[PDB]
Amino acid sequence: DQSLNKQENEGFNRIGFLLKTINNINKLPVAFNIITERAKEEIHNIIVKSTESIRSKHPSLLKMATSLKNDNHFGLP
Amino acid sequence: EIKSLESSNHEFLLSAVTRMYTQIKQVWSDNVEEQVLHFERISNATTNGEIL
């Protein structure tokens, strides 16, 4: 795409980020906006969000702690 | 004379439209270092540039 202006797996990346991200007219603060929101709040948002989703999806954290499987039953199952 | 006159607005005062239109739609980069410019309340350095 850089060489172009110097589903194709996955065309949504350069496509949506191109025609979205080039159609900004005062972009230069908004780049810092998506940066400074997305770093902390997105990284902790996803990394929280999946473990939440399993953490109530079929939890049952039963096999609560190890069920005392000694000791060094280190991820035995 | 059409190479002076039908040679269009160059006579380039649409660069003034680039000066106000790019004084507003490009105020998100120069003032991005200079939101507080002459002070440090919003903590920014007094630098925007005169280019164009």
UniProtKB/Swiss-Prot annotation, chain A:
Transmembrane segments: none annotated. It is found in: Cytoplasm; Cell membrane. Component of the exocyst complex involved in the docking of exocytic vesicles with fusion sites on the plasma membrane. The exocyst complex is composed of SEC3, SEC5, SEC6, SEC8, SEC10, SEC15, EXO70 and EXO84. Belongs to the SEC8 family. This is Exocyst complex component SEC8. The gene is SEC8.
Swiss-Prot record, chain B:
Component of the exocyst complex involved in the docking of exocytic vesicles with fusion sites on the plasma membrane. Present with 377 molecules/cell in log phase SD medium. The exocyst complex is composed of SEC3, SEC5, SEC6, SEC8, SEC10, SEC15, EXO70 and EXO84. Belongs to the SEC3 family. This is Exocyst complex component SEC3. It comes from Saccharomyces cerevisiae (strain ATCC 204508 / S288c). The lineage of its organism: Eukaryota, Fungi, Dikarya, Ascomycota, Saccharomycotina.
